[PDB]
Design a protein around this nucleic acid. Sequence first.
RNA 1: CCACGCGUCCCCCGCGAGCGCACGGGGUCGGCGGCGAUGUCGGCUACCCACCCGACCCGUCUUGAAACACGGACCAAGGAGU
RNA 2: GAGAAAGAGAGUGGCGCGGACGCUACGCCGCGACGAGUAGGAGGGCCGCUGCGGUGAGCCUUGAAGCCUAGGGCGCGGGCCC
Lengths: 19, 51, 128, 124, 63, 216, 225, 109
Amino acid sequence: IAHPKLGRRARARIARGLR
Amino acid sequence: VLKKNPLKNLRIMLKLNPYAKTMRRNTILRQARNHKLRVERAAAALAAKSD
Amino acid sequence: AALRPLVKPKIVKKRTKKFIRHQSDRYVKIKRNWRKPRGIDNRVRRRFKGQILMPNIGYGSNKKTKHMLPSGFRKFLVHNVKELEVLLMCNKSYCAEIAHNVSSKNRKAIVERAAQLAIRVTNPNARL
Amino acid sequence: SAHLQWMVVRNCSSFLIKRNKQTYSTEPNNLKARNSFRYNGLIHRKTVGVEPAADGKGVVVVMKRRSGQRKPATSYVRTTINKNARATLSSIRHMIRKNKYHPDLRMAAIRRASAILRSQKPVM
Amino acid sequence: GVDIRHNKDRKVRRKEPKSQDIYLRLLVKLYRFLARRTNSTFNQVVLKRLFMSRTNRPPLSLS
Amino acid sequence: KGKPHCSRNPVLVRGIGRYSRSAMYSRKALYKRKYAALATVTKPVGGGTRVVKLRKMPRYYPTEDVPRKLLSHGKKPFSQHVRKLRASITPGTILIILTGRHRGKRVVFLKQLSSGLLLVTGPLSLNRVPLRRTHQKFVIATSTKIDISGVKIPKHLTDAYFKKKKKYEITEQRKVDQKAVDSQILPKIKAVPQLQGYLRSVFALTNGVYPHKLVF
Amino acid sequence: NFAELKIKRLRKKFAQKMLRKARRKLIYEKAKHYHKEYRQMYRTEIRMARMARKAGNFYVPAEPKLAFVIRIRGINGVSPKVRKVLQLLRLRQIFNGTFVKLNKASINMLRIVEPYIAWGYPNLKSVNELIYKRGYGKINKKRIALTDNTLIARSLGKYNIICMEDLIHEIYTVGKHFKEANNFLWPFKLSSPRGGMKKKTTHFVEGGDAGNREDQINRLIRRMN
Amino acid sequence: SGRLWCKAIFAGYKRGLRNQREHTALLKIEGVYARDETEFYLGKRCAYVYKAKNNTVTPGGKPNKTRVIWGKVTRAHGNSGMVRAKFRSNLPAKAIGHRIRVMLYPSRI
RNA sequence: CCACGCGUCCCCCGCGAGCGCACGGGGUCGGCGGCGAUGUCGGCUACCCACCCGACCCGUCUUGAAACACGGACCAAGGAGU
RNA sequence: GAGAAAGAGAGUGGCGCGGACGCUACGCCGCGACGAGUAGGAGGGCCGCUGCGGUGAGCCUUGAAGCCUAGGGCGCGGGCCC
Ligand SMILES: [Mg+2]
Ligand SMILES: [Mg+2]
Ligand SMILES: [Mg+2]
Ligand SMILES: [Mg+2]
Ligand SMILES: [Mg+2]
Ligand SMILES: [Mg+2]
Ligand SMILES: [Mg+2]
Ligand SMILES: [Mg+2]
Ligand SMILES: [Mg+2]
Ligand SMILES: [Mg+2]
Ligand SMILES: [Mg+2]
Ligand SMILES: [Mg+2]
Ligand SMILES: [Mg+2]
Ligand SMILES: [Mg+2]
Ligand SMILES: [Mg+2]
């Protein structure tokens, strides 16, 4: 999750999951 | 940048290592709890010695 | 009310005593002006304890407080009245001195022009 | 050009003056009067200058025009402003900003105009 | 103190040309800018070669 | 909006809350609290209507100006500092003033003023010391207390009341407050034997008398 | 129009902020796992000593692989072989210190320098306090004090060393990239020992201070640090 | 109406054997002769009081001839309760063996 | 407990907003008190004197000079890599 | 300044007129580590002397050079200004 290229969609999904 | 001392200064230690917050919380809770346990055992042994 | 500068720092000086050239107290033919001595047995050049000190670079003043008068200003030697419209802009950092050669009837005009242009003169009442 | 003239003027001009660990330039269109490429008022195609009037009231503001660069007589245009301190500075501010006329030194022109005005109001 | 020997503590290479030519110094004023603000090392090599001496920029011939 | 609550973390030590981030998520109940999504006035002039511009441009400019400082954080002003006392100074203890014109004299302590200073009267019937401020550090605090838990100092006296104005004249409310607080203090120290003589006397160091050897 | 430019740069700033927040949760849980690892490493040797004692046998523990070396004798009057090995140990000033992993080459290197150094086996508190108090990094061959995790992550991130806890972990538990982490660490500048040395010139066995103090280096780090 | 300063004697400067450092006074305070007892006097205001020829000012009073050089008491010095001190101006060596007052008022009690 | 949703396909079992405190990229006070026109205030430096510590006279030849090694009473001007 | 080779890149379809300083680029600014020195080598002098070409619409009998000074000062220093 925490490195940029391969965790981009995972950070996007947890950003949506905050909402 | 002025190098502050992470052993003395707290939020610099947290900036370098955010798990130090929960370590230094759990050890305060642990030491306070062990302290009240030893005080309760000392009071119990003193009451049993009084009897 | 004097003409106070813009900023007035704490001028720390590392050394206030001058550098006496070695054995200037002794003879009269030796003037007090420092010369580093090139002796082979010289007690000063090899810097023994309790001797005349040597002017190293480390005694140099801070660059922010270098060439700075105790009032906070820096000198600027002025000959005629046309060399004060130069300091028209540097009003709060740089002050004016009038040269020793300048006559009285021109020093008067210099002092009144600097009083108009708000420039401190270090010696405003020199000859009169 | 400009940089070519600067690489000659920078250490050889007779307006340059060097003493007491300072340096200056006594040329007639030098805001802040210091020796720089930015503030030199001879080596540029466009240049402002702020001077006191020959009369003891106001400020003459000097602009360098576009066309007559090699014609020194009809090169500078001089406008004498004799009014209050706020509108004098607003006039110089509009004159430099909204013409886009060398905006490097609008603030230096405003500082010099205010210095002339405080020297020109009567001395206490 | 430190156990450091100070023989080669200073690089010998140039920072500027030793000419008081002004056209070469305007070229240097341009290529300092292009050397520090591009990521092409052609600008660094040509900056170094404007810096050099007459004998280290020898005349290349047309042939 | 809602009514503001107090801190749900009880403070464990300074800078550490007693509850972790998940437990404080639970105590705040953030699982169910999600969310998703000037310069001109127009005035009439008897002309037309003029557009007056408040906050006008400056008239003058200094010929060169200082730059803006960098921004540092922990440097509060004096009026909102935290104020500390020593453990040996409690309301009712007797003090030995060491510095001013009332040096050496023993004094009943009243309360902590809002500006760090101590409120003081060794009562003026005894050693001629009024309702005066003093500094905490400049005072020896002996181990002799009186129980003033039931006295009422007037609340209208603070640092703003004892602050110097600008010869000095005693006002009338100084005398009234003096008698009003002495009528509460002085019968409570006449209850302790030999205490009024102790407050009338002064402190001194004689021969063979050293402060580090003597407790007080 | 700009109404898409502002919202795009807001989304980009938010994206890198959420990236940074994910990195902070990463180094948090890595430090938790490291704490669990150190609990296991400390109790494992005790548990194996106990099972050997109740079986009647002995338990020779793991011969330690990490030492901390301090230069106690000054610049002047050094044999050239000795000053070459002190240069390869990066001990140039007096009262410098470096971590050194142990093998057959390095033990003989420490032996050939032995009258000039005090070197021992540091514990986890020693490694912690040397890293946090005196630990700097050789970044662009400058000496930048390790005030943030990004100073470590920019230089050693390709060795999966992204925080100071990862640095401490590899130094203590000597890993694969111990050379690179150690050579990232600048030589430590310790103060003169409070309380003072008993004798500088003679060996620790004969009541001095030079030589292989084994784990009594954890008294001397506490008062040079 | 009595003395409010402890008695101390300016023993010397802080000195090595072939070097003295005049920025730090050495004060021998009367009565305390051990480091367990010197702890009360740390951080105290100490003062060297002397007279002169021509008058100087006096704060809260009339101009008179007495003068001072103020200072603090920094830290202990050796096992015998000797203490160090630092003064605003370094002391003249007139004062070797003269009564420096050590006040009480920077108090920690 | 640095764990928090809904929806589906597979296997084992990408912008939420505000305010605020601060062990947070180097000090500030949105705190004070005294004395000041004929005797006081500031001036480190430069004049004299006192005291503590230090302290052998330079140049040179020299392995090594304070040397019981040589040159030198003192001062002004001239005086040696052109 | 940001742990992660590389665009706050473009196109085609589904009221109030305002914003400090800077940049003698041979200038200014930021980081680190460093500082012994005879013979000797080198760099920089807005250190100093005399004269020449330029130049300061320079200074000067309303007092230049020189010299004296318990006066005020600047520079690490050569020296310099009142
Ligand atoms: Mg000799
Ligand atoms: Mg010799
Ligand atoms: Mg060194
Ligand atoms: Mg060398
Ligand atoms: Mg070299
Ligand atoms: Mg000690
Ligand atoms: Mg002696
Ligand atoms: Mg000879
Ligand atoms: Mg011989
Ligand atoms: Mg020889
Ligand atoms: Mg002999
Ligand atoms: Mg003979
Ligand atoms: Mg001979
Ligand atoms: Mg002779
Ligand atoms: Mg050197």
